Amino acid sequence: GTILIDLSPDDKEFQSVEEEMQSTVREHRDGGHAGGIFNRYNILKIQKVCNKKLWERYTHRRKEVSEENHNHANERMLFHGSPFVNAIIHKGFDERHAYIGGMFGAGIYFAENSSKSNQYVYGIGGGTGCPVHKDRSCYICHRQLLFCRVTLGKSFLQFSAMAHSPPGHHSVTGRPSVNGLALAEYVIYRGEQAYPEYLITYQIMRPE
Ligand SMILES: O=C1CNC(=O)N1Cc1ccc(-c2nc3ccccc3c(=O)[nH]2)cc1
Ligand SMILES: [Zn+2]
Numbered sequence: 001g002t003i004l005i006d007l008s009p010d011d012k013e014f015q016s017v018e019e020e021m022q023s024t025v026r027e028h029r030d031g032g033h034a035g036g037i038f039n040r041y042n043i044l045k046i047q048k049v050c051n052k053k054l055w056e057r058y059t060h061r062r063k064e065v066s067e068e069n070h071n072h073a074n075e076r077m078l079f080h081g082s083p084f085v086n087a088i089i090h091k092g093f094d095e096r097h098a099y100i101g102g103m104f105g106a107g108i109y110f111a112e113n114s115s116k117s118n119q120y121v122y123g124i125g126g127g128t129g130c131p132v133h134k135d136r137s138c139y140i141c142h143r144q145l146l147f148c149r150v151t152l153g154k155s156f157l158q159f160s161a162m163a164h165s166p167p168g169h170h171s172v173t174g175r176p177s178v179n180g181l182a183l184a185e186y187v188i189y190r191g192e193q194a195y196p197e198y199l200i201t202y203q204i205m206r207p208e
Contacts, residue, residue, distance in 0.1 A: 002054070002090045004047040004199060017147055017198050018043050020077070025115045026181050034126035035119035036137030038204035044142060045201040054092045054195060058149070061192035065153040065170050074152040078110035078186060080196070081117035083127070085144050089199060093191035095162045099124070104172045104187045105163035108194065110150055112183030117145050118204065139206045147198040152186060165189045 007014040022040055032038075066073040082088065084097055093108055100106045101124070111117045121143045122129055122136065129136035153170025161178040165171060170193070176182035188194060 002049060002051040004049060004089070007046045007048060013048075014046050017046050017200065020147065021079075021114045021145075021200060021202070024079075024113045024183065026113050026183070028115060028119065029179060030119075032137060034136060035115060035121075036126075036139075036204045037207065038115075038137075038139075039207050040205050041114075041202040042205050043200065043202050045199075047199045047201075049089050049146075049196050049199055051089075051092075057092060057192050058151075058195040061190065062151045065151050065193070069153045069170070072153075074155065076110075076150050076152060076186070077197070078112060078148055078150050079114045079117035080108075080110050080146040080148050080194070081120035082146075083121070083123050085121075085146060085196075085199070088146065089196050093194050093196070095191065097191065098162045102187065103160065104158060104174055105189075107162055107172070107187035107189045108191060110148060110186045110188075110194070112185070114145065116183075116185065118143070121145065137204070139204060141203070143202055143204070145200050145202070146196040147200060149195045149197050150186065150188065151193040152188070153193075155186070162189050 098106045126136035130138035130141040155171040155173045156166040156169040159177045172187040174185040
């Protein structure tokens, strides 16, 4: 039941999503090994992801979390990169999209930094890079990320350099504790706590 609606670059909604993509790029401690070397993206397309059933699945769970947390869903817009972006937008997030080996346990991981999620487009650690050139830093091939609506509820704070949420919590927040420029990363343990709102198609751009 999924349909993808293209946003025009003139649409304020395109512009605000692009600006969150671009403004949350940072340098990574791997010097670009996983995600490539770039300071910015070439945004090719931004599509709104419309699926009534998946939306209602999300809002039902959101109300549950909200009622468990003094009427506060603690909803964020966060990035998600994955080899499975195309199954996600059709079938929703579930246990099969979880990073089993992630540092906060087997859950589904999201980033404030678009460049962090970009490191997972071709798999963990960038995998073997793009399908066509086997290049983790490919400047040619078209990549895709999701910009997702995520319900955090009461989030467990982890200071730091599917399973269940910690008892009494609905998510985990990975707070950066060494790299002062890194933004937070988050983990949910129920696929119903995220909705893939935007599909963004882009290239990373070679610095000049
Ligand atoms: O567990 C595996 C093994 N191969 C694979 O594609 N997965 C699924 C997977 C999907 C997304 C991510 C992912 N992990 C992150 C960790 C931190 C921040 C962002 C992300 C992010 O955007 N995506 C990790 C693993
Ligand atoms: Zn390529």
